[PDB]
Amino acid sequence: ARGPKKHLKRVAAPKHWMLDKLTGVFAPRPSTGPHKLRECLPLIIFLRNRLKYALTGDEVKKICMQRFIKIDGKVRTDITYPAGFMDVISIDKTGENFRLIYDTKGRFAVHRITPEEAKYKLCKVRKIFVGTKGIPHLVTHDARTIRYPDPLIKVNDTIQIDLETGKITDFIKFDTGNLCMVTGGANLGRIGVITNRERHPGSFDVVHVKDANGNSFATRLSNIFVIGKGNKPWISLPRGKGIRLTIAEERDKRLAAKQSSG
Amino acid sequence: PVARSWVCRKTYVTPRRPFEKSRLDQELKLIGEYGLRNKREVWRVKFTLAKIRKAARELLTLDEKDPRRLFEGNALLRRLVRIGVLDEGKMKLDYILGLKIEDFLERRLQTQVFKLGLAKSIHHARVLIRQRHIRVRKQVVNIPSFIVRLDSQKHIDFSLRSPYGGGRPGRVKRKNAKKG
RNA sequence: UACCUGGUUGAUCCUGCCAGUAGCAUAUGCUUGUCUCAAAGAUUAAGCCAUGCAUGUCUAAGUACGCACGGCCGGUACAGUGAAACUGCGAAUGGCUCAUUAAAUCAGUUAUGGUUCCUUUGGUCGCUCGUACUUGGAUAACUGUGGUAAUUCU
RNA sequence: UGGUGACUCUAGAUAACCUCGGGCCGAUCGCACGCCGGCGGCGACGACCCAUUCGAACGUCUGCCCUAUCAACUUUCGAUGGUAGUCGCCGUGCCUACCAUGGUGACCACGGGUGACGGGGAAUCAGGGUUCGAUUCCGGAGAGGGAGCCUGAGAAACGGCUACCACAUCCAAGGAAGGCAGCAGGCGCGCAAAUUACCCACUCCCGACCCGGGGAGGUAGUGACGAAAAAUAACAAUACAGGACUCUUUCGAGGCCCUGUAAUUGGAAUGAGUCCACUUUAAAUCCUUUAACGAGGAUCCAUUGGAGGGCAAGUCUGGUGCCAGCAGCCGCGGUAAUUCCAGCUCCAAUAGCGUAUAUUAAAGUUGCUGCAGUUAAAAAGCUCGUAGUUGGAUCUCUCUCGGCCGAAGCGUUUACUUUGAAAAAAUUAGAGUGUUCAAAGCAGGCCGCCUGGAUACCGCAGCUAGGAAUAAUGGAAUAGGACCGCGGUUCUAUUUUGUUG
RNA sequence: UCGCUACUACCGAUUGGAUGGUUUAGUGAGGCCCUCGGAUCGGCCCCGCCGGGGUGCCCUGGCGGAGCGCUGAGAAGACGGUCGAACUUGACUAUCUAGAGGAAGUAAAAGUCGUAACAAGGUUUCCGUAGGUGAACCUGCGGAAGGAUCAUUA
């Protein structure tokens, strides 16, 4: 082509958006923003497809244009604004609050959350650089730059952002024994304790993780998000606890859970 | 670009040798016994059996403690018990290979309308289904090759709008009542 | 469903090919009552094209002295709705086709510590020691006078 | 100061420069209104630089069909490399000057061809394979053929411009305007392919924008490409010089079960149509739902090929007489034709069935699995020989640190094997789900709640970790060999002398 | 060995014509870059007719004029560079096209002379190689048995 693409076909969309085959040729094509377009959920899919508030891609316009929707505490009037991981969606006309966390199957989830928790979010530190008369900066995975960080914040750690002010409150460092969520790959949405981190200089670090049932897995280092210090998550978790069931016992859960009916 | 799906699938295979006696004879006996219309209704039920034998014959090379054999093999027997072809005590993966065409043809809605006595012949069941006289639990079923599941066998009846079960007479009885 | 069958000789056993057989795709013939999906000027000519349409755009928030409407009140800078034109932005996407092209394209895998990036999101934006309670000149739309057989010409 | 595996990085300091074709440091719009002439709160536009997002570009490794009647190519004119620069967003013979004489080639370069855009995929298939992939997704290219630009973040842009070559429209003859491989439509070509229809309601995109626009896209029309479901009748009473079951030695006795060359009788059932209404939709249609009409040669008739063998099914009758013609092959036809032309009857598939051509299986007739070579097609006249291919036995984890448990090193290097993580979606396989079944779909279910939208497969090449059999390879043979402590020569760390030379 | 009708392709005179692809040489539209150029458009001056303010002098308002004044903006056009479509003529070709002559194989042939071969096929046959003919062929040399001998006597 000559210059950038503005459309997204539907079959070429991310798999986790769960758009069906026969509704159209095109998919919502996320706007440029804090998140990669493969790693995000546009606001039109959260309102029309997941929450079933809207029914067409004109009612999402009519909802967002009444300024009823705050994404990380700022009002968003773009329906294809890419909301990504750990983003807080506050709808104040109804009274709900959501956080975008992955579930055990590699998609996002409708995770309703308490407005006492919706005042903060976690971010992962991505590059730390000095400059401009010797003033240090962070860059997180939301492109949030927070100048003057704590000197004990390094790369691959986790900060906790206050969402009304933009400032760091307290952090977690990258160590063994910390509770982490995988945000990419085939182990995506899984929660476990960091066991081990193997270094491959000139290539990617591999971080072996251990479940709460004993299921060990590994990822590359970039798909690792430190959620808690020790084993206590600093955010809430979804209905499943980040623990992937194999399909046999995932069947057993259904064929035993239907027997509570009557 | 279009929002259409072109995913289709043929549901039968024709034989390699077209004029073979005792293939012709056996399929004609299965056409006459079960009230079917043409050869393609036998070649269709031969094809779903050949898909079930083939998938079990693949699953028999993996060992008994395979993940895939234990999951997908228990889900193959579950369907064959569910439609009433297998029984419940024969749920090893090797009584699949002892299934036949007639086990699958006894579960059509046509032969079940004949078995329950709502018809009086196997060709009387084809018309009584096709004239919309037969319902399954609430729903008028208009297709004779509707494979009746095991739980839906106790609810097969006479379709409350019909002259046979419901009571408002047809086209012919009312005209003869007009000429009375 | 891991398959064969007719054809060389007076008869036989072979080599071996012809011929049948079954899909699948393009054409085509004869026929065609219902109902659900569905391809469709690729192959030959990346041959040639009448006519029409396919790319435009205004919020409270750049520029309103069009009475084009109407509206207070008539010294009230500008009530308002607003065509036009200036300004901004897009038109580089989408659609179509397969002529080129044989380590080329492309696929997987890496690299930019060898580079640009409208936009979006976050940062930064009294960090410089040296008429402002607001600066200057044009130009459309408009009015008015024309040219050319003829153009989204001027 | 902070960093990476590694900076000539990021910051800091100093001396200067800073482009008149100038580098930022706001002469901008709106809404509520104010607090003590000042101090104001939310926004909208801007904006150098940094980061991010969306990309783009240029590279790394590995991989592709046919051809040797293509065996040497590249190098004046850049071919391979070195130095200095020019250009360019930047790395580079990208280009220029001066040098060096190199670079690729049986492991098939170079040249030619392709009825070659490449992949994801599709057909067939025991296992191995073979062939197709223009075609809706990703990537490339191109707008009649080459070439050059303007604008802009982005174009060597063609629903932009300037030329030239090729066509071609108007003209008052001076001039003017072109580009359907967009949607329709036309001509031509051909074996070969649909409407100059309706709409922005859906899916999304663009814009100053909740408002406008979109032949993108959706909806209809044509459509036996192709795939799914599926009518063309069912039933009962009689009768048969029909069959079967109980008795009679047998004649023959029966609603006990079946059958029909009964155009025998008889009502009961129903769509196809015709058609009000609702529903569907942007508005319509179609299907679904319902009025009313709607079947007895139920004329509301089912066709396409065949009846010698391959191969299901008539040496029946009439005609023709090696003619006409049939026949994929074998064969048929010369006066009795099982084969032609027909009538009857029968067979096969059945709303479908013939024919032609491409291709796959059959083909173990291309053979890796897995063929052949005395006589059927075939072992070179003999020998030497480089590349290739193939090669006999043999050999049973530790040092400096942190809290015995982790770093760091290995050991000679690999092939192999097993695990891991990374591998677009759609397709394929496969789980769940009564689309009325099914092909499909990604839905649904319960009396506001409860769900699902799994998973496998994803060659070769590249990462990772365990194994150590097999197979290649090293390790000392004139010991300039291992391990030890002994001495010399050269360079040299940065702590040591309260700071200070 | 020797008689009839037609096609395929090549040679094929004709220095028959028309068009591609590679290069030799010459030419070179248009854009861009450079060096010039300077049609026009301002501005600042200087006087002249003159107001006010301050105090003969300075700043202001209307103009007017002239100067090769001295600066800013700038069109046409040219030199040179570069990119490069294209044109002209040669060579190598390749392809579309008109023409007597003859050439080879193909469709059959049931037409005439011998009888080469298969029997010891009436000269066993076959192989290579040289020579001669109406021709199947014949002959000189050297093989083979696929021979008509698996054998011939101290």
Swiss-Prot record, chain A:
Keywords carried by this UniProt record: Acetylation, Cytoplasm, Isopeptide bond, Nucleus, Ribonucleoprotein, Ribosomal protein, RNA-binding, rRNA-binding, Ubl conjugation
Main subcellular location of this protein, as a coarse class: cytoplasm
Ranges for domain S4 RNA-binding: 41-103
GO biological process: cytoplasmic translation; positive regulation of cell population proliferation; positive regulation of translation; ribosomal small subunit biogenesis; translation
Residues modified as N6-acetyllysine: K232
GO molecular function: RNA binding; rRNA binding; structural constituent of ribosome
Glycyl lysine isopeptide (Lys-Gly) (interchain with G-Cter in SUMO2) crosslink, residue number(s): K229
Compartment annotation: Cytoplasm; Nucleus, Nucleolus
CDD domains in alphabetical order: KOW_RPS4 (cd06087), S4 (cd00165)
The keyword Protein transport belongs to this UniProt entry's keyword annotation: no
One Gene Ontology term, aspect cellular component: cytoplasmic ribonucleoprotein granule
Function of the protein: Component of the small ribosomal subunit. The ribosome is a large ribonucleoprotein complex responsible for the synthesis of proteins in the cell. Part of the small subunit (SSU) processome, first precursor of the small eukaryotic ribosomal subunit. During the assembly of the SSU processome in the nucleolus, many ribosome biogenesis factors, an RNA chaperone and ribosomal proteins associate with the nascent pre-rRNA and work in concert to generate RNA folding, modifications, rearrangements and cleavage as well as targeted degradation of pre-ribosomal RNA by the RNA exosome.
Protein family per UniProt: Belongs to the eukaryotic ribosomal protein eS4 family.
Quaternary organization: Component of the small ribosomal subunit. Part of the small subunit (SSU) processome, composed of more than 70 proteins and the RNA chaperone small nucleolar RNA (snoRNA) U3. Identified in a IGF2BP1-dependent mRNP granule complex containing untranslated mRNAs.
Protein name: Small ribosomal subunit protein eS4, X isoform
Protein's organism: Homo sapiens
Curated annotation (Swiss-Prot), chain B:
Main location: cytoplasm
Entry-linked CDD domains: S4
GO-annotated cellular components: cytoplasm; cytosol; cytosolic ribosome; cytosolic small ribosomal subunit; extracellular exosome; focal adhesion; membrane; nucleolus
A GO biological process held by the record: ribosomal small subunit biogenesis
InterPro entries: Ribosomal_uS4, Ribosomal_uS4_CS, Ribosomal_uS4_euk/arc, Ribosomal_uS4_N, S4_RNA-bd, S4_RNA-bd_sf
Family affiliation: Belongs to the universal ribosomal protein uS4 family.
PANTHER family assigned to the protein according to its UniProt record, in alphabetical order: 30S 40S RIBOSOMAL PROTEIN (PTHR11831), SMALL RIBOSOMAL SUBUNIT PROTEIN US4 (PTHR11831:SF46)
Protein name per Swiss-Prot or TrEMBL: Small ribosomal subunit protein uS4
Organism expressing this protein natively: Homo sapiens (Human)
Gene name of this polypeptide: RPS9
